[PDB]
Structure formats: structure tokens, C-alpha cells
Amino acid sequence: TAGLAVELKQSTAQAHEKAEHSTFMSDLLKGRLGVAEFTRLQEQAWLFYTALEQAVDAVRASGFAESLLDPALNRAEVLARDLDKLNGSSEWRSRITASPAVIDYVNRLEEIRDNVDGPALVAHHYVRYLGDLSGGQVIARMMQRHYGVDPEALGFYHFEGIAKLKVYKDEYREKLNNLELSDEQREHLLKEATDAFVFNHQVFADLGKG
Numbered sequence: 001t002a003g004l005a006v007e008l009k010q011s012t013a014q015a016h017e018k019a020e021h022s023t024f025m026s027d028l029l030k031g032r033l034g035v036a037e038f039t040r041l042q043e044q045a046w047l048f049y050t051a052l053e054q055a056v057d058a059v060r061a062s063g064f065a066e067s068l069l070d071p072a073l074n075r076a077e078v079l080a081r082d083l084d085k086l087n088g089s090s091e092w093r094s095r096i097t098a099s100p101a102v103i104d105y106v107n108r109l110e111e112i113r114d115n116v117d118g119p120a121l122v123a124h125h126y127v128r129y130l131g132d133l134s135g136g137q138v139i140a141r142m143m144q145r146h147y148g149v150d151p152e153a154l155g156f157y158h159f160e161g162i163a164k165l166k167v168y169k170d171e172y173r174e175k176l177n178n179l180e181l182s183d184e185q186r187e188h189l190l191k192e193a194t195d196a197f198v199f200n201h202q203v204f205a206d207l208g209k210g
């Protein structure tokens, strides 16, 4: 009854807590791991952002949720520049491979792309980008504080082109609230958002294993 933004936040609250408290991310943010582990995270993130942004491009071109799907949010290119700095060269592009979690995640994003599934893509968009614009700011700060990571290797978290972020988020939620969705599309979107958080928790679990 309070609009889609609120329903998404409430709907995914428990899944958010599970991802945030994963052993890998918990250890990362409290200073127990290192830049190597952060780097492995960001390499997996490059694979799934690449897939997410192909799906965004498809859905944006279809005409669905256009104002929400702001190209300033695109991360794949800044992320690759971060990885170039973290790894010291371009070597990582041909070394990295998708964890099992990331294979499932990418596969689903590729399904959304080729189906041009607007509702599903909005879900995935919200789970990643609003998180980047939220908890990601804390992540960036702790990578600097605990591990001495150069801010220039955290371009992913900076969102060049965006100034006031709370305002940006507020407007993001207004756009969510204003999307024209049938009951079936809204239900599909909410279920997808839970799956997005599920994939993201498993990315952390698989990083935790090796």
C-alpha cells in the first residue's frame, strides 16, 4: 500500500541481512582479509556487471523504465580500470573465470536480456545499483581504511556524473513508484529481487570457499 520502493525494501530485507552478514563480506569489512580478496570480489563483479549492463541496454532500448535506467550508473568500464590498477596490468581479463555462483547469476541476467524482461531487469538494477549507492559507500571507505587501497582503484563506488546521492536515491525510488506495472509484472519483479539477493549471497559464499 506504500508503493513499490517500500515493498521492495521490505520484501528483501531479510535477504539483505543474509548477504551483508556473509562470512566473506563480514571478514572483508572488519579488516580480516585483504586487497587480494577485495580484488577477487571485484573480478567476479566485473563478470556480472557486464551481464547486467547488457540486459539494461536491451530493456532501455525496448522503451521500458527508461528514466530509471540511467547510463551514468554503468560500472563495467570504471570497474575494469579499477581492476587494471589493483592487478597492475590487463592480465586479469584472460585469467579470471566465473565462480559457480556467478555462472548462475550471469545466466539469469542473459535470460533477462534476450527475453527483454523489463520487470526482472528493474529488480536486478535496484538490487545492485542502489546497494552500490548505499552500503557500497561504506565498502569503499573500509577498503581505504583497513587495506590502504588507493581511492583511484575504487572508481566503481564513486559514480562520476552524480553529485548529491541521497537526492539521486530519492528520485530513483520515485521512478520505481511511478513505473506502470500489472499485478503479474509487480509480483515477477518482487520475486526477481529476492533472487538477485540470493545470487549475491552465493557470490560471497563461493568467494569464501576459495
Ligand code: HEM
Residues within 6 Å of the ligand: 005, 008, 009, 016, 019, 020, 025, 126, 127, 128, 130, 131, 132, 133, 134, 135, 136, 138, 197, 200, 201
Ligand atoms: C551484495 C551485497 C549487498 C547488496 C545487494 C545490497 C543492496 C542494498 C540495497 C538494494 C539497498 C537499498 C534499500 C532501499 O532503500 O530500498 C541497500 C541499502 C543499504 N545497505 Fe546494502 N547491499 C549489500 C551489502 C551491504 C553491505 C555489506 C553493507 C554493510 C554496511 C550494507 C549496508 C547498507 C545500508 C546501511 C543501507 C541503507 C542506506 C545507506 O546506509 O546508504 N549493504 N543495500
Ligand SMILES: OC[C@H]1O[C@@](CO)(O[C@H]2O[C@H](CO)[C@@H](O)[C@H](O)[C@H]2O)[C@@H](O)[C@@H]1O
Residues within 6 Å of the ligand: 009, 010, 012, 013, 014, 015, 016, 017
Ligand atoms: O538499511 C539496510 C537494510 O537492512 C535491513 C535488513 O536487511 O534493516 C536492518 O538494518 C536497519 C539499519 O540499516 C535497521 O534499521 C533495521 O531495523 C534492520 O532490520 C532492511 O530492512 C534495510 O532495507
